[PDB]
Amino acid sequence: DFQGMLEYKKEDEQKLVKNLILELKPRGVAVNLIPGLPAYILFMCVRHADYLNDDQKVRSLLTSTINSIKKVLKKRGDDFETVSFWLSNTCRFLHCLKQYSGEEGFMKHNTSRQNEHCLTNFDLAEYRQVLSDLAIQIYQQLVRVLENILQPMIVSGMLEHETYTLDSILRQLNSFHSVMCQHGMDPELIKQVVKQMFYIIGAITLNNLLLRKDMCSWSKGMQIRYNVSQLEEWLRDKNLMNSGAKETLEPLIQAAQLLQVKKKTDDDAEAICSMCNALTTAQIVKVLNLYTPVNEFEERVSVSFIRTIQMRLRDRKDSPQLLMDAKHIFPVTFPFNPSSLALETIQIPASLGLGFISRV
């Protein structure tokens, strides 16, 4: 009848964080069978220190933990799997510190047995704040690493290819999503990362239309709309249509629609002004100025037509922005997701190299 706590000797604390954090492999069998396993084990160690009422041990374990996570991200900070794994486990460690805090506001999902596993001697609120701030830093690093992977693929994948293709972009998105799922990343965080990836796709693609006459054509509008259709089918396949990702593409979609509509009459001008509610006046006017007719039997958009559009939009008080900030990162929100996992049932796998830890 174990109680869901883990004991270790003071002198072994550096071996503990070495095997549990510094040299722990994100692909290992045990941590893939039980996502968040390192966080759960670390928390069970915290529980025992708290049970002993040993303030020095609690302090030292928490600091060693935070410092070790920082060290692994400094060393392998360009490796997406490592960053994903540690964002997930930092969040799960924080979920544990909350779920088993003994504070009622965090215990609403607990079973009666889980409530028996709450900390009793220490208030770790200040350490939870350090962890939360760390999770923000890790999320920022993750989004940077993933953007650097996707960025070279976007223009060729979305615009040039009729070298990277759209399938290249989808293959990467599939890999990112698969990995975050394997790590047990909070579903709300996965949705934010996907939203952030759709944002850069839309922003880099639109910024290319806005800079290049050769990309502003009826045919390019058709290609973009087809490519967006496949990105939306991807969200549908993954159950991600509530992530906000599709909405990030609306300026691109409207620019593509603008490339295809009629651009001659007063009625056509009125339709453009109603359709392009996600584009600024500067962007609409730029696309119309750059628009390149397929051949001599299609006329350029006239100067007078563009002035009609400017006249109709004259009362909009919109942003002066032309190019999008493609590296803009939406501020992250973190959910609290207490789990059903019963600590008293957690087996310490032999593979982790943690024989010096004992169950209590």
Alpha helix ranges (H) inside 264-325: 266-275, 281-290, 303-312
- Distance in angstroms (rounded) separating the CA atoms of residues 68 and 198: 32
- Distance in angstroms (rounded) separating the CA atoms of residues 150 and 170: 10
The answer to whether the beta carbons of residues 68 and 22 sit under 8 Å apart is yes
In whole angstroms, how large is the CA radius of gyration of the chain? Answer: 26
Instruction: Read off the tokens for 281.
Output: 């006046």
The total domain count for the chain is 1
Name the CA dihedral angle for 318, 323, 326, 330, rounded to a multiple of 10 degrees: -10
Alpha helix ranges (H) inside the chain: 13-17, 29-33, 37-51, 55-75, 80-99, 112-115, 125-155, 166-182, 187-211, 218-237, 245-248, 250-260, 266-275, 281-290, 303-312
- Residues contacting residue 230 through CB under 8 Å, at least 6 positions apart: 166, 170
First to last CA, the chain: 9
- Residues contacting residue 241 through CB under 8 Å, at least 6 positions apart: 235
- Distance in angstroms (rounded) separating the CA atoms of residues 350 and 360: 17
- Distance in angstroms (rounded) separating the CA atoms of residues 87 and 135: 6
The answer to whether the beta carbons of residues 223 and 165 sit under 8 Å apart is no
> Which residue in the block uniquely carries the two structure tokens 């799997």?
81
Task: Give the structural domain span for 114.
Answer: 1-360
Strand partners, 7: 358
- The method recorded for this entry reads X-ray
Name the CA dihedral angle for 283, 145, 338, 28, rounded to a multiple of 10 degrees: 150
Handedness of CA 92, 93, 95, 100 (dihedral sign): positive
Q: What is the resolution of this structure in A?
A: 1.9
